[PDB]
Amino acid sequence: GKDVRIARWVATIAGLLGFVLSVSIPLLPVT
Amino acid sequence: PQGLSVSAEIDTRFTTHPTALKLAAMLLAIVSTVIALLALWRLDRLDGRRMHRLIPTRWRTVTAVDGVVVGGMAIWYVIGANSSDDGYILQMARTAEHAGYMANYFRWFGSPEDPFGWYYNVLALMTKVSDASIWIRLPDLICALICWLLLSREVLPRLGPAVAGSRAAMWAAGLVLLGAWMPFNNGLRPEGQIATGALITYVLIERAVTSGRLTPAALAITTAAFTLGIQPTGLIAVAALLAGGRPILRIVMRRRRLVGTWPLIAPLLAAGTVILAVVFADQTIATVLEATRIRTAIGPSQEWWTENLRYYYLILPTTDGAISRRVAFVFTAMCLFPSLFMMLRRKHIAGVARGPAWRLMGIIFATMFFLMFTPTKWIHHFGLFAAVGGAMAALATVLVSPTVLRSARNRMAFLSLVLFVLAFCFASTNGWWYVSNFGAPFNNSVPKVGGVQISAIFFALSAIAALWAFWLHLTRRTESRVVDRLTAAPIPVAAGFMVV
Amino acid sequence: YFLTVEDSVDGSLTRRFAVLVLLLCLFGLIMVLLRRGRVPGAVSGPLWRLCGSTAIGLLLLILTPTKWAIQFGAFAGLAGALGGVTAFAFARVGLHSRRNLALYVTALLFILAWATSGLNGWFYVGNYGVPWFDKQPVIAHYPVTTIFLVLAIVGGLLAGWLHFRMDYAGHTEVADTGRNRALASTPLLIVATIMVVL
Amino acid sequence: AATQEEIIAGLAEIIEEVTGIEPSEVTPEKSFVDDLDIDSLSMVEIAVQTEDKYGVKIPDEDLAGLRTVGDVVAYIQKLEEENPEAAAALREK
Amino acid sequence: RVTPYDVGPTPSWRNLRYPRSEIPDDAVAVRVVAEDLSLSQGDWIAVTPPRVPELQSVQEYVGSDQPVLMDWAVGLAFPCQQPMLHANGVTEVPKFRISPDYYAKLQSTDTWQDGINGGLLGITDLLLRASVMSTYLSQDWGQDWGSLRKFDTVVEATPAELDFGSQTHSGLYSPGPLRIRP
Amino acid sequence: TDTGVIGGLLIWHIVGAPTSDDGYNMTIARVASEAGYTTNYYRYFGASEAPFDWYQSVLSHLASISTAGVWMRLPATAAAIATWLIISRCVLPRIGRRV
Numbered sequence A: 001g002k003d004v005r006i007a008r009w010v011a012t013i014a015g016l017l018g019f020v021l022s023v024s025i026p027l028l029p030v031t
Numbered sequence B: 001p002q003g004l005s006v007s008a009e010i011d012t013r014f015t016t017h018p019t020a021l022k023l024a025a026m027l028l029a030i031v032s033t034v035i036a037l038l039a040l041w042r043l044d045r046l047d048g049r050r051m052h053r054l055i056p057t058r059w060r061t062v063t064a065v066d067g068v069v070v071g072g073m074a075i076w077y078v079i080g081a082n083s084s085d086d087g088y089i090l091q092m093a094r095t096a097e098h099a100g101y102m103a104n105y106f107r108w109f110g111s112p113e114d115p116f117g118w119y120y121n122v123l124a125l126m127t128k129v130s131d132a133s134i135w136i137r138l139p140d141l142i143c144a145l146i147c148w149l150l151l152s153r154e155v156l157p158r159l160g161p162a163v164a165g166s167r168a169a170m171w172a173a174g175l176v177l178l179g180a181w182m183p184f185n186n187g188l189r190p191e192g193q194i195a196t197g198a199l200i201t202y203v204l205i206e207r208a209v210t211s212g213r214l215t216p217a218a219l220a221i222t223t224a225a226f227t228l229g230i231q232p233t234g235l236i237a238v239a240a241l242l243a244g245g246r247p248i249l250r251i252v253m254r255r256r257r258l259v260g261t262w263p264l265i266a267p268l269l270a271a272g273t274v275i276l277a278v279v280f281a282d283q284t285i286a287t288v289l290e291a292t293r294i295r296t297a298i299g300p301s302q303e304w305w306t307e308n309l310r311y312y313y314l315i316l317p318t319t320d321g322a323i324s325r326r327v328a329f330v331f332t333a334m335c336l337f338p339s340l341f342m343m344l345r346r347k348h349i350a351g352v353a354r355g356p357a358w359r360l361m362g363i364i365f366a367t368m369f370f371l372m373f374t375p376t377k378w379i380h381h382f383g384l385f386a387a388v389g390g391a392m393a394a395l396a397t398v399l400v401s402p403t404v405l406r407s408a409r410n411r412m413a414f415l416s417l418v419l420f421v422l423a424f425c426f427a428s429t430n431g432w433w434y435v436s437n438f439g440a441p442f443n444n445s446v447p448k449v450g451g452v453q454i455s456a457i458f459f460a461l462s463a464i465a466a467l468w469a470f471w472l473h474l475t476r477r478t479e480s481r482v483v484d485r486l487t488a489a490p491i492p493v494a495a496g497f498m499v500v
Numbered sequence C: 001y002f003l004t005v006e007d008s009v010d011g012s013l014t015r016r017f018a019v020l021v022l023l024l025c026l027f028g029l030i031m032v033l034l035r036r037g038r039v040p041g042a043v044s045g046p047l048w049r050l051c052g053s054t055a056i057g058l059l060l061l062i063l064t065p066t067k068w069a070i071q072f073g074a075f076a077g078l079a080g081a082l083g084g085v086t087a088f089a090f091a092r093v094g095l096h097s098r099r100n101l102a103l104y105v106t107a108l109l110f111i112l113a114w115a116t117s118g119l120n121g122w123f124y125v126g127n128y129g130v131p132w133f134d135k136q137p138v139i140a141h142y143p144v145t146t147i148f149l150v151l152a153i154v155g156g157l158l159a160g161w162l163h164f165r166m167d168y169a170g171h172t173e174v175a176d177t178g179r180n181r182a183l184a185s186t187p188l189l190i191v192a193t194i195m196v197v198l
Numbered sequence D: 001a002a003t004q005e006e007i008i009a010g011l012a013e014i015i016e017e018v019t020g021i022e023p024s025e026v027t028p029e030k031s032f033v034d035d036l037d038i039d040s041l042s043m044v045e046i047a048v049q050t051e052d053k054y055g056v057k058i059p060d061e062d063l064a065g066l067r068t069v070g071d072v073v074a075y076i077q078k079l080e081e082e083n084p085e086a087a088a089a090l091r092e093k
Numbered sequence E: 001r002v003t004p005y006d007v008g009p010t011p012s013w014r015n016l017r018y019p020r021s022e023i024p025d026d027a028v029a030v031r032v033v034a035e036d037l038s039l040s041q042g043d044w045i046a047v048t049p050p051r052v053p054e055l056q057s058v059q060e061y062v063g064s065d066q067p068v069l070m071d072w073a074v075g076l077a078f079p080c081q082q083p084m085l086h087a088n089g090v091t092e093v094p095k096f097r098i099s100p101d102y103y104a105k106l107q108s109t110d111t112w113q114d115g116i117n118g119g120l121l122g123i124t125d126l127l128l129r130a131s132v133m134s135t136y137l138s139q140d141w142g143q144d145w146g147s148l149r150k151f152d153t154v155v156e157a158t159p160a161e162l163d164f165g166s167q168t169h170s171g172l173y174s175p176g177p178l179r180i181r182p
Numbered sequence F: 001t002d003t004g005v006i007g008g009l010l011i012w013h014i015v016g017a018p019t020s021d022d023g024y025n026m027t028i029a030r031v032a033s034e035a036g037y038t039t040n041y042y043r044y045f046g047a048s049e050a051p052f053d054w055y056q057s058v059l060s061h062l063a064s065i066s067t068a069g070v071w072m073r074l075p076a077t078a079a080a081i082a083t084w085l086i087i088s089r090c091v092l093p094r095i096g097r098r099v
């Protein structure tokens, strides 16, 4: 438990998925 | 009669709208970007520093230049000229709500502004209130007030106590900002916004270097991305990153002793690549490739080795390159090159920081270089320098002061150069574009004071100044006093002349 | 402008190369004479006047009435004597660092990519049998300018990678051996003899 | 390292890089905002750089109480005299 | 006598303006006096009886709801006119066309928006017939503000109904290249 | 280096394209023996080349022996051999002994 041990995870995760979900926007179904 | 039929199938390939999954991804690649930035901020707040004041004490000051610049950009926003691409963009923005996409309205078979049209979707929202000329051009006045507020309070005080303390530098910065913003960045072309993004990026990078944090260096990458997403000529915003990449890497490789490398590299990627979720909101990579194919197969291609056209169009005496359309570039080159040759010789100027002063010149050089590789070679692309020419002129006015250039020969040579630049400026017509050309004094001919041009007068003055410099060269004289009066702040006057 | 016009025989590639190399040598020697106080080995007295002559000539070329691109031939006596001092100053310059050498090489490669983007035509009768007089040079089907450009961008990326790490590896010089004593100075001889042979 | 002529010689090298002020102008009597035109956004940069070259953490609440150069040298002498376990003396004196 | 104002190019038909200020308050009759006085052929003259036009503002004649084809230069001078909207690939049919002055309309707003390279002048050449109207710039005669044309249909036709549908693609789908050049 | 440069400069005096004004300065020099002066033969209403006609007045004496292009361009090859010899023996040894 810490306010930094969790901030490191929230900066690694939710910073990596916010990039893998951004290069997949040009490639997605559109109506 | 039964049997007859004609069944055409329309090509509606650009009128798309995201599904229930593209929306879920676009509304997530932003939440999980602001969250990454908040985590990076909580990490950066480890050093024990906070914010004591909402407004730094170097901001709460008013000079006689603030009044002049504000009142000269607030009455030129009413009576001033407009660029040649305002009808073009207004016509393409009034119809974008009905068409369903940002269609290029007059050319290329209705192919949209592929990846470079997140800004026109803001004018498409502004046109819902009203499309008057006094209202639809507001982001061109706000992005000038902001540009001045930055250039006069964050950029000049950073360049050292000799650029912040000398009044001639502030006057030169203001007058060159005005002279480079008046003819280019007043219409609807998004050059006044690129010139402000490329300045916010530099300011945020300088703040990161100052405070030693990284959270104002991911916002710099976000600003550079959102500025490059406006137009292909927004590469100045990434030149501002390349110029300030070494002192940022110096903090990336210095903070990682406490937190590691991933919690520092991941948000720098999430903030950098978040521009895709805004560029590809309505369009798609297939339609973007098709539009680009059309635009390159039909419109002006202008391969990179044809970049001399941008300057060939400038020396011709036409409405394209006029008296006012040359200042933005000449007052940048004439203030950049001798300042570079003087920063090379001297390594201690006693009042100028070398880091910021070198980054400011690297930005301009990289911009003037990578202005090639742009799909089109127009003159409107000289409006980018409106923001970074003010600081360059404010640095040159200090570098050529009678206390920094101690020899009268060098100052007289610089005065001759300034007069020659004015002579080159005044060697063309005074024409404006469509209806701003109604009633202009010399809208059709080169200005003449009677028989003799005005460029000839400035050339005959530059020749005399060069002869004076040569006579000070031969006899080895450096203590002349008349040149101390003549060569005191010659750039502010040369810019105020064109502004007036 | 006349010197660099697309699909023109006034400015060929052989004519763009000469002027671009002259300007490179001039503005590199001036930068070395400003940055460093002198060039070791060459006396700095006439080395300053040799650059002053070229600069004042390029400035005096403003007054001429006709400004064709063939009037650069008056500097063929200064370019020969200047490119033999440039390839000697830049040896010592780019021997003290691995970044200056990369910058020199990529500047040469960009000058080559810019020059090779034009024709090879000479004149009315001189174009009888010349290889690339009617079209810009291609190797098999790729233009040569794109090859030299993708080499220049690689050189630039390598120079940037050597610039960004000057704070971690300290500042280490190259060893003054035979393989490096004659490697920092062979550029501007390689490309110059290539253009001469061409 | 309580020698004033060393503390000032080390502070001038940071001031000259951060701001550009010559190292001959930094006397133990000048003020950081009147005589030298060093605002607070440069004092924070100086306090950041002094913790990278040498190991010294200048607290945020006490950095604002450093008006003159003499105040800086007195504060450093005070920080040094009551903390003889200055392990930050490694290869940086 | 009253010297006329002459704006447009002069091998062709034009209007010659005689402002009623240059005539006094006692002029109750007017008559033309044309004189060639030149032997060479190539220069000549032509005359229509004088007329006092019954003018009207463009904002009043061209309403604020009729579709208009404005060139890419005339967009900020005419903010209240309505452009030629398009939706679902089908464009509206304009009624008037607004364009800049002669030496601009000729070499800028005709090569740019040309029919062979995607412009809107590939529709109004197949479908409509343009007839130039007679416009004047108020109180600033002798100035070339531009030109206003009128589009008349070749044959009487009505808009379509354009059956609709919807389909979901996969981000990489492309039904083939467009028809650009032969 | 002198041998190589002079060889590549003499095997270019033979197989080498002439410039854009080899025919201008040639007729100007051939029709200048008569006509009384150095007339600009293709333009300017017979106006002479008044300040710049000491080179055509030498070409007009070379164009009387033989008009062959390999002989009229002889002062444009000696002025290159001398230029290179100067550059390599009086200029470079002056700039430095080690250059």
Ligand SMILES: CCCCCCCCCCCCCCCCCC(=O)OC[C@H](COP(=O)([O-])OCC(O)COP(=O)([O-])OC[C@@H](COC(=O)CCCCCCCCCCCCCCCCC)OC(=O)CCCCCCCCCCCCCCCCC)OC(=O)CCCCCCCCCCCCCCCCC
Binding pocket: B341, B409, B410, B413, B414, B416, B417, B420, B462, B463, B466, B467, B469, B470, B473, C023, C030, C048, C049, C051, C052, C053, C055, C056, C058, C059, C060, C062, C063
């Ligand atoms: C009409 C105005 C036209 C433009 C005005 C521009 C004036 C500014 C330019 C002047 C400076 C450039 C020229 C010299 C540069 C190089 C000099 C040099 O390296 O040293 C050799 C020499 C000094 O060597 P030194 O004293 O033995 O050196 C000892 C130590 O090394 C100590 O060395 P240092 O540190 O003392 O010297 C360092 C040098 C080094 O720093 C540098 O910045 C050199 C780099 C400059 C680069 C310039 C390159 C321009 C080339 C354009 C290329 C275009 C490329 C772009 C396109 C690319 C796209 C593909 O920095 C300077 O010299 C700057 C101070 C210059 C004092 C000049 C006093 C006389 C002013 C002469 C101005 C008139 C010249 C133009 C005449 C005709 C114009 C129409 O420089 C000179 O003294 C030359 C001055 C004599 C010039 C005489 C001309 C006077 C004629 C009077 C009449 C004017 C017009 C009449 C026509 C009107 C009839 C209708």
Ligand SMILES: CC(C)(COP(=O)(O)O)[C@@H](O)C(=O)NCCC(=O)NCCS
Binding pocket: B050, B051, B052, B053, B054, B055, B056, B057, B058, D039, D040, D041
């Ligand atoms: C740091 C401090 C509390 C005091 O600094 P000072 O010495 O300049 O007064 C104040 O200047 C400050 O920086 N407040 C927060 C900064 C900020 O966000 N300003 C917004 C203007 S862009």
Ligand SMILES: OC[C@H]1O[C@H](OC[C@H]2O[C@H](O)[C@@H](O)[C@@H]2O)[C@@H](O)[C@@H]1O
Binding pocket: B084, B085, B088, B089, B104, B113, B378, E072, E112
């Ligand atoms: O960039 C805005 C919009 O208008 C640009 O066209 C360029 C126009 O400016 C030139 O002077 C004119 O020739 C041209 O009308 C579009 O390319 C772009 O979408």
Ligand SMILES: [Ca+2]
Binding pocket: E036, E038, E039, E040, E041, E043, E044
């Ligand atoms: Ca007749």
